[PDB]
A paper describes a structure:
Cyclic ADP-ribose (cADPR) is a second messenger that mobilizes intracellular Ca2+ in various types of cells including sea urchin eggs, T-cells and pancreatic β-cells. In biological systems, cADPR is synthesized enzymatically from nicotinamide adenine 5′-dinucleotide (NAD+) by the action of ADP-ribosyl cyclases. cADPR is readily hydrolyzed at the unstable N1 link to give ADP-ribose (ADPR) in both neutral aqueous solution and under physiological conditions, thus rendering chemical synthesis of non-hydrolyzable analogues attractive. Residue Glu-146 was identified as critical in regulating the multi-functionality of CD38-mediated NAD+ hydrolysis, ADP-ribosyl cyclase and cADPR hydrolysis activities. We report X-ray crystal structures of two non-hydrolyzable inhibitors in complex with wild-type CD38, one using an 8-substituted N1-cIDPR analogue derived from structure-based design considerations and another using a different hydrolysis resistant ligand, cADP carbocyclic ribose (cADPcR).
Preformed crystals of wild-type CD38 were soaked with a solution of 8-amino N1-cIDPR. The structure was refined to a resolution of 1.87Å and contained two molecules of CD38 in the asymmetric unit with 8-amino N1-cIDPR present in the respective active sites. The 2″- and 3″-OH groups on the “northern” ribose form two hydrogen bonds with the carboxylate group of Glu-226. In addition to Glu-226, the pyrophosphate group interacts with a number of previously identified amino acids including Trp-125, Arg-127, Thr-221 and Phe-222. Importantly, the 8-amino group forms a hydrogen bond with the carboxylate group of Asp-155 as predicted by our modeling studies. The higher definition of the X-ray maps for the 8-amino N1-cIDPR/CD38 complex, in addition to the extra hydrogen bond between the amino group and the carboxylate of Asp-155, indicate a likely increase in affinity of this ligand for the protein over the parent N1-cIDPR. Indeed, 8-amino N1-cIDPR inhibited cADPR hydrolysis with an IC50 of 56 µM, over 5 times better than that obtained for N1-cIDPR. The crystal structures of N1-cIDPR and 8-amino N1-cIDPR in complex with CD38 were aligned based on their active site residues. Both structures are very similar except for the position of Glu-146. In the 8-amino N1-cIDPR complex, the side chain of Glu-146 is displaced significantly to form an H-bond with the N7 atom of the hypoxanthine ring (such movement of Glu-146 could not have been readily predicted from the non-dynamic docking protocol used in our modeling studies). The conformational change of Glu-146 probably reflects the enhanced affinity between the inhibitor and CD38.
Residue numbers in the entry: 48 to 245, 250 to 296
The structure:
Amino acid sequence: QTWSGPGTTKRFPETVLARCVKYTEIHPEMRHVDCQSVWDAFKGAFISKHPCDITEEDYQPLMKLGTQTVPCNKILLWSRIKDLAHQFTQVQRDMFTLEDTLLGYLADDLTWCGEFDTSKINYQSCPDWRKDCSNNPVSVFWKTVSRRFAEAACDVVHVMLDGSRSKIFDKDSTFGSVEVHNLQPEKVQTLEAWVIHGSRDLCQDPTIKELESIISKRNIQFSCKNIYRPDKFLQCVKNPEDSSC
Ligand SMILES: Nc1nc2c(=O)n3cnc2n1[C@@H]1O[C@H](COP(=O)(O)OP(=O)(O)OC[C@H]2O[C@@H]3[C@H](O)[C@@H]2O)[C@@H](O)[C@H]1O
């Protein structure tokens, strides 16, 4: 193929449009959104543009339309453990991840790119962030929304981390390279990490100490908890202290 990454997801346009409709139906705060407009702004960011030359400015019309307030003190970040984060917030909406927002919901699990000097979508391949370029439509989208999500957070912010990874905290992740550096010291009191086990006290892991030290220097308190049994954890969230939770 031209590029090394997978092509635009089959039915991408129909899918984004349908997700926008469904989202705006469910969430009253976004009932004002015109979904065709959202789609046109989304398209505008990457159609007829070189897919290794995308900027955050390309996504500004979309950011504008998807403008949204979520409770700033109930934010859940995560790294390498998306599924658990999603299952947790779905129980009773204790917290909100980026996918609980319109823009995050539209884009989750999709890939897309265009081509320079033709107005079509590329269903054959899209740039891989490593081999091709990092300035590609998908990578640039997530960097942009994740920066914005972190900037809006306040009070106690939580992050779920995968304890089974080689680096439980990875400075190379979007959490580690973007979100950590965009939490606002004026607003964020504490970052609390939940390290999910797959054992030891993983909160004393070296990369966790690194995370602690980094956020301390931004003037933010750090807290850490082991979640030894994600299965029991979810059961306790669903059945709160009904049992021995
Ligand atoms: N679908 C999706 N939602 C995402 C999200 O909300 N965030 C980042 N990436 C996201 N993705 C895609 O999922 C893959 C894999 O992401 P990883 O497991 O390595 O974790 P990370 O890099 O630390 O990003 C998570 C972090 O940033 C925000 C979010 O708020 C969260 O706090 C990304 O490349 C992206 O294409």
